[PDB]
Amino acid sequence: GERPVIETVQRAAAALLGASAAEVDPEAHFSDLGGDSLSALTYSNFLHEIFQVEVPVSVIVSAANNLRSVAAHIEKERSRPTFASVHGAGATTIRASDLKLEKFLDAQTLAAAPSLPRPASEVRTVLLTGSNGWLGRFLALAWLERLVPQGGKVVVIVRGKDDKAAKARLDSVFESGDPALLAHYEDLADKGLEVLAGDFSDADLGLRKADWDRLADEVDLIVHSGALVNHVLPYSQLFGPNVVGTAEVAKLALTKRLKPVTYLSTVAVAVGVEPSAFEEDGDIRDVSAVRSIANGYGNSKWAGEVLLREAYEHAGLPVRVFRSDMILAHRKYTGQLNVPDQFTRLILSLLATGIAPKSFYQLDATGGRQRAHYDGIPVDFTAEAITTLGLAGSDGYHSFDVFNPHHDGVGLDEFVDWLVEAGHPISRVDDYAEWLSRFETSLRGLPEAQRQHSVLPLLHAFAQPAPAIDGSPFQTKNFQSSVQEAKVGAEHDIPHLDKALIVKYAEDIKQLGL
């Protein structure tokens, strides 16, 4: 450097986050100093310009990495598939034809892949990614409930300095003030959960070579729920976690014996296509073969689907893709809701400000409230459905759109009615434009703790009232009919969102102390 690299790394962090330059010890972590994925991008671009090497946001925010690791990464880079080698350096568009398995996996794996032994008839061991995430924790719990009674095992890869720290990170997400959940988790975890520290963007999933080789022999099925889920980051930042990560998962599925892959995806892969032309269960390579650079998020998840489709075509790897956005709170376990998402932020904001519009949707010609539907599914149903259908996917390639398709007239205005019925003081402001300005003023007047958990960062989305759509514009038949045939839950169908769920949001928000 000029100047050793670690010093520039510490000073930049100190400047960016407002620490004292003695509190920016090289063993400290970016998140412990007040950092998050917004400031991590600023940091990444700053160090990128100074040292002329890529410093991905994933390296900065990972629980395994401290500021020393960031410095080490920079110096290693100055003296592994990338955006340049796959899509061409500085490219402004991307193509499905770019994403071939030859660019991610070695030739020996690919050559031996077509003739590999077929999936095991009985699933006893499952590898799960993203288990400390919002959806993944309940996928983990669903698999433990099934496999522990049959003497089976759930293997889990979590980011952390070592296996101990990784397990502690997973343990803590089940601590939400619900004693029954914690006892249920700990009972099952002792009997059937193996936690390994790792990182799916790295080679051999960031594991010890002996563990990777063991899993290639031992794992019957792979559930890939892990990803960097960020709607503002560009495709270049999400390439490592979401595209290369998916390729590394596929590599394990195409070694020793074939392992069916459940892959989590998003409605954001339909960005660039009209909703009516988006075939739920079509070939994703045909449904959008070319794309421009939630744009990066959508593109990254799309790219993962393409690679898994290539793996199916090359070796007959069974795949089940599940496209899911806005996975709402657990209906039974208290304190279990996705705190950062837009829906939770909105509900918290309405309770904090105590004011709501006559309608979030467009009014009719006579100024009245129209019929509308909120597309959302609770996590407890979603986890059971994905696990049931994924377990049944030992042959072929199929995709499901995990959305709420009901033409039931249950939307945001009904949720506000239900909060008022339950006793929460929410006033109904008649004019939408008057609401929005009053809402923004009241939000800005809240304490610092509450403002950061509010919807204030996402206020641009509420500028105009949304269009009054009942049902969902995307096709769901494959998911809904499969759920009906499999007879999932009490409903034997995708559930309707109800008063009990909305009332529970308010109690969850209080219980977590927001």
Descriptive overview:
- This protein is an alpha/beta fold.
- It folds into two domains: 1-79, no CATH class; 80-514, NAD(P)-binding Rossmann-like Domain (Rossmann fold).
- Helix content is 43%, strand content 11%.
- The chain has a seven-stranded parallel sheet, sandwiched between helices. A two-stranded antiparallel sheet has the order 1-9. The chain has a two-stranded antiparallel ribbon with strand order 6-7.
- A hairpin with a 1-residue loop joins strand 6 (254-255) and strand 7 (257-258).
- It starts with a helix and ends with a helix.
Provide key terms for this protein.
514 residues; Rossmann fold; 2 domains; seven-stranded parallel beta sheet; two-stranded antiparallel sheet; 19 helices; globular
Task: Write a brief caption for the model.
The protein is α/β, with parallel strands linked by helices and 514 residues long. The protein folds into two domains: 1-79, no CATH class; 80-514, NAD(P)-binding Rossmann-like Domain (Rossmann fold). The protein has helices at residues 5-17, 37-51, 57-61, 67-78, 83-87, 107-112, 136-147, 163-173, 179-192, 209-218, 235-253, 295-315, 342-353, 379-391, 412-421, 432-444, 448-453, 477-486, 499-511, and strands at residues 93-95, 125-129, 153-158, 193-197, 221-224, 254-255, 257-258, 261-265, 290-292, 319-323, 327-328, 355-357, 377-378, 397-401, 427-429.
Whole-number count of domains: 2
First-last Cα distance:
44 Å
The SS-based structural class is alpha/beta
Strand order of the largest sheet: 4-3-2-5-8-10-14
CATH topology of the largest domain: Rossmann fold
Overall shape: globular
Largest sheet: 7 strands, parallel
Which value, in Å, is the CA radius of gyration? 23 Å
- CATH homologous superfamily placement of the largest domain: NAD(P)-binding Rossmann-like Domain
Number of strands: 15
Number of distinct helices: 19
Percent strand equals 5-15%
Helix content: 40-55%
CATH class descriptor name of the largest domain: Alpha Beta
CATH hierarchy: architecture of the largest domain = 3-Layer(aba) Sandwich
